[PDB]
Amino acid sequence: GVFNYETETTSVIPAARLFKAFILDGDNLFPKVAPQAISSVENIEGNGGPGTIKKISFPEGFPFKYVKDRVDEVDHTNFKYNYSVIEGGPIGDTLEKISNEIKIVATPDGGSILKISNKYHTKGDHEVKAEQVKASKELGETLLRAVESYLLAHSDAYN
């Protein structure tokens, strides 16, 4: 079958406020609290729901870095936000594809828990060098930390 690279982490931020920011405004906060992950977003179709298509740009130097990527299954109620990769610079048809999945869940501890599942579809004699994989895990963790840091760097009260 394909490859899998799912992960999960905890956060003192609420799963609701964290979801909207990583889901409703995720594409807008990506290039804001993470200039090293996504440069900008260009919704081609869909309104951010499941199957939506948006041109995500990646801050890199190679010839191809951005990509189309289509949403998989969004859920503004069950805290579910998954998106697949389809028109990638390197991707031409459907080989070396990638299907991710994001799920946030608040816990009775003053925070919530996020679970990010990732998939890597390969074919022919090609494969997935951990490199691009190790770089995705480092960037994925920086995204969840970039948002948690922000919400914590807020200022609504003084004493």
Swiss-Prot record:
Gene Ontology CC: cytoplasm; nucleus
UniProt signal peptide: none
Keywords for the protein's UniProt record, in alphabetical order: Allergen, Cytoplasm, Pathogenesis-related protein, Plant defense
Pfam families reported in the protein's UniProt record: Bet_v_1
Record: residues binding brassinolide: K54, Y81, Y83, N100
Resulting phenotype, E45S: Strongly reduced interaction with BV16, hypoallergenic
InterPro entries the UniProt entry points to: Bet_v_I/MLP, Bet_v_I_allergen, Plant_def-hormone_signal, START-like_dom_sf
GO molecular function, one term: signaling receptor activity
Superkingdom: Eukaryota
Keyword Cytoplasm belongs to the record: yes
Matching PROSITE patterns: PATHOGENESIS_BETVI
Compartment(s) where it occurs, according to its Swiss-Prot or TrEMBL record: Cytoplasm
GO biological process, one term: defense response
Gene3D superfamilies xrefs: 3.30.530.20
Similarity-based family: Belongs to the BetVI family.
Function: May be a general steroid carrier protein.
Protein name in UniProt: Major pollen allergen Bet v 1-A
Protein species of origin: Betula pendula
